[PDB]
Design a protein around this nucleic acid. Structure first.
Ligand code: CA
Ligand code: CA
Ligand code: NA
Length: 327
DNA sequence: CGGCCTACG
DNA sequence: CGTA
DNA sequence: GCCG
């Protein structure tokens, strides 16, 4: 019954199997740290399947037939049901390698490959990295400098204040341009690690050159701690707070209005939902999906979409609102 | 056996 | 590589 | 790790 792709089923923000899904997601993260994206994907998919179930899993029987559950994922759930812990998960959680790779990869500018090299070189703490600034890109230096603030969850009050200052800079740069909140907050999350905004203009072509003008205006008002023709900017903002300020990660994306439904769909996520949707598009429908469009490679044409709904329909999928894309 | 999302900075 |  |  349960469809195999995450884009074929609603996944709400609040679900009934958090304990099991979190354990599988530890194994997925660990698989990524060891360089097996395939195992990561399977463990992520299996966790997502549990998020889409209508009720708590209490019996191994209830896993029968579910997609992406084989011997390994089923054994993990079995142990959790019988004993409340899975030895493999606990061994991973308590391992120095897992703990350090999680610490390093959570830095803005550091991924698995970089963290692994630092691990192999003996480094273990943020202080170790600060001790060796020559080994850091400018992006990594900013990530490390603002790490404490960037580890603090971004809340809705932060989003509203940020949207206001982004709208003001955007309006100064180009009358009639619009700002749309995307990412997890658009899916209904109450917190996030960053805020995502999608910027366009109703007249095709007027948005050319917009993002540099927006960034200059934000930087002139003292709002930019880090950034850097371009159409995406992964920034750190200096967000005013009562009597002070805190650093907040902000992503800005500019798209022409012809691409806006594709950009909105891509940037609203979740990350697993969108990878699954792009996989479905290519493997099941023979069409190539990205944040710019949906391409038929045999006719060499792009699908004209006015809404996210149009895209789902052209893929033969029942429409899912953003709050049901929490795969 | 091999595939596993995508492309910009 | 990083965004992730 | 799971699946086409
Ligand atoms: Ca986000
Ligand atoms: Ca983001
Ligand atoms: Na990172």
């Amino acid at each position: 019954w349960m469809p195999a792709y995450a884009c074929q089923r609603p996944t709400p923000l609040t679900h009934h199997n958090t304990g099991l899904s979190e354990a599988l997601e530890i194994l997925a993260e660990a698989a990524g740290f060891e360089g097996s994206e395939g195992r990561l994907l399977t463990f992520c998919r299996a966790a997502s399947v549990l998020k889409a179930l209508p009720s708590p899993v209490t019996t191994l029987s209830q896993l029968q037939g579910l997609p992406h559950f084989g011997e390994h994922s089923s054994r993990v759930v079995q142990e959790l049901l019988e004993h409340g812990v899975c030895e493999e998960v606990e061994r991973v959680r308590r391992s120095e390698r897992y703990q350090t790779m999680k610490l390093f990869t959570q830095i803005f500018g550091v991924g698995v490959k970089t963290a692994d090299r630092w691990y192999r070189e003996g480094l273990r703490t943020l202080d170790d990295l600060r001790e060796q600034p020559q080994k850091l890109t400018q992006q990594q230096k900013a990530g490390l400098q603002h790490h404490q603030d960037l580890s603090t969850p971004v809340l809705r009050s932060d989003v509203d204040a940020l949207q206001q200052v982004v709208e003001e800079a955007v309006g100064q740069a180009l009358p009639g341009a619009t700002v749309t909140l995307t990412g997890g907050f658009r899916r209904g999350k109450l917190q996030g690690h960053d805020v995502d905004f999608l910027i366009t203009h109703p007249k095709e072509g007027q948005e050319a050159g917009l993002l540099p003008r927006v960034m200059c205006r934000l930087q002139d008002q003292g709002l930019i701690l880090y950034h850097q023709a371009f159409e995406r900017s992964f920034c750190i903002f200096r967000l005013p707070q009562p009597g002070s300020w805190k650093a907040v990660r902000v992503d800005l994306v500019v798209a022409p209005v012809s691409q806006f439904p594709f950009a909105l769909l891509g940037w609203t996520g979740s990350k697993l939902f969108q990878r699954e949707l792009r996989r479905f598009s290519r493997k099941e429908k023979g069409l190539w999906l990205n944040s710019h469009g949906l391409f038929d490679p045999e006719q060499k044409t792009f699908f004209q979409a006015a809404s996210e709904e149009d895209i789902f329909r052209h893929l033969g999928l029942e429409y899912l609102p953003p709050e049901q894309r929490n795969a």
